[PDB]
């Protein structure tokens, strides 16, 4: 179970926007750390909407199972604050924020080598999850957080972490799921209980498309009815103009879940490039 954090030890500062039934804030946590030393630590506070408190079990279940695993490319959760009427996840604050935002802001400056490094790191994280038979269920560029920027001067690559899953697609309303096409795979639109390890291979493909597409969101021009028909017609996403990962994207986004490559195979493919 999660460490319980007192509301009195948390200060809410600026809003970072809204997620799926959540409000996100930057905050400060006062804590006693190692050696009895007092700290004030920057934290990310995820607040489940009061109106959607029926989703709290899924909201926290997500975080919990993954926080039972420690991995360098997985975001650290510090604990929960369940004081009063609020349900709050207290998470590590990742300095450079979401990859999708970063891709759009720095697109002129991002090259294939940076992209490959980030893809490899994401694949490493997903391989670890696969090995542990843990389904993430919401792999996407917004849910990849940049801990550190590339520094050519020192040969340091960028470094990312994958955030928590959030409320499971197995409990979310149909209209939200449809809006999340083409991250949610076709079999999960058919039946959200089809959530499986193969789910994350599909979403990984979509995420690679994002990584190659400068922060663009695939199929954003299609309304929900048209996104449904896209899957009914068995279309694939267009190749990004920077096409180096296009074959890998299509191999991951295979309409037959059984044919989607293992993360081991994905990593081998990535290692074979530039
Ligand atoms: N750990 C973090 N550190 C720094 N910024 C973060 C962190 N997590 C989220 N953010 C910022 O908060 C914004 C909202 O995040 P996001 O949309 O993932 O919310 P969510 O509650 O996780 O919803 P979903 O389940 O849809 O992902 C993001 O764009 C991101 O920049
Ligand atoms: Mg998120």
From Swiss-Prot:
Result of altering residue 4 to L: In myeloproliferative disorder with erythrocytosis; requires 2 nucleotide substitutions
Tissue: Ubiquitously expressed throughout most tissues.
Lineage: Eukaryota, Metazoa, Chordata, Craniata, Vertebrata
UniProt PTM comment: Autophosphorylated, leading to regulate its activity. Also phosphorylated by TEC. Phosphorylated on tyrosine residues in response to interferon gamma signaling. Phosphorylated on tyrosine residues in response to a signaling cascade that is activated by increased cellular retinol. Undergoes Notch-induced ubiquitination and subsequent proteasomal degradation which is mediated by ASB1 or ASB2, the substrate-recognition components of probable ECS E3 ubiquitin-protein ligase complexes.
The protein's role, per its UniProt record: Non-receptor tyrosine kinase involved in various processes such as cell growth, development, differentiation or histone modifications. Mediates essential signaling events in both innate and adaptive immunity. In the cytoplasm, plays a pivotal role in signal transduction via its association with type I receptors such as growth hormone (GHR), prolactin (PRLR), leptin (LEPR), erythropoietin (EPOR), thrombopoietin receptor (MPL/TPOR); or type II receptors including IFN-alpha, IFN-beta, IFN-gamma and multiple interleukins.
Family label: Belongs to the protein kinase superfamily. Tyr protein kinase family. JAK subfamily.
Signal peptide: none
Noted disease: Chromosomal aberrations involving JAK2 are found in both chronic and acute forms of eosinophilic, lymphoblastic and myeloid leukemia. Translocation t(8;9)(p22;p24) with PCM1 links the protein kinase domain of JAK2 to the major portion of PCM1. Translocation t(9;12)(p24;p13) with ETV6.
Cellular localisation: Endomembrane system; Cytoplasm; Nucleus
Comment, domains: Possesses 2 protein kinase domains. The second one probably contains the catalytic domain, while the presence of slight differences suggest a different role for protein kinase 1.
Site (Breakpoint for translocation to form PCM1-JAK2 fusion protein): 175-176
Name listed for the protein in its UniProt record: Tyrosine-protein kinase JAK2
Domain of life the protein comes from: Eukaryota
Gene: JAK2
Positions carrying Phosphotyrosine: 35
Protein kinase domain span: 10-274
Source organism: Homo sapiens (Human)
Subunit and interaction comment: Interacts with EPOR, LYN, SIRPA, SH2B1 and TEC. Interacts with IL23R. Interacts with SKB1. Interacts with STAM2. Interacts with IFNGR2 (via intracellular domain). Interacts with LEPR (Isoform B). Interacts with HSP90AB1; promotes functional activation in a heat shock-dependent manner. Interacts with STRA6. Interacts with RHEX; this interaction occurs in a erythropoietin (EPO)-dependent manner. Interacts with ASB2; the interaction targets JAK2 for Notch-induced proteasomal degradation. Interacts with MPL/TPOR.
